[PDB]
Design a protein around this ligand. Structure first.
Ligand SMILES: [Ca+2]
Length: 79
């Protein structure tokens, strides 16, 4: 709709919680692939958030996800 979908975060959030708030590209991706998530979609989300390019997504990176989602889909609309 805008930039990110709350539905996506739910998928990544759940898988992240299972790994202990921390997971690597390979582990999260496998957990994502088993849910029906495409590599392209995962790579975009992972690249988008993995600003450190450490090929790893942590609770910190995921935190921005929820924040970035609310600044767009929350507190505003038509502007
Ligand atoms: Ca990272």
């Amino acid at each position: 709709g805008g930039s990110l979908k709350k539905n996506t975060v739910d998928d990544i959030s759940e898988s992240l919680r299972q790994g202990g708030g921390k997971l690597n590209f390979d582990e999260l991706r496998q957990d994502l692939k088993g849910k029906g998530h495409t590599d392209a979609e995962i790579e975009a989300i992972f690249t988008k958030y993995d600003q450190d390019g450490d090929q790893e997504l942590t609770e910190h990176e995921h935190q921005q996800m929820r924040d970035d989602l609310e600044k767009e889909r929350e507190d505003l609309d038509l502007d």
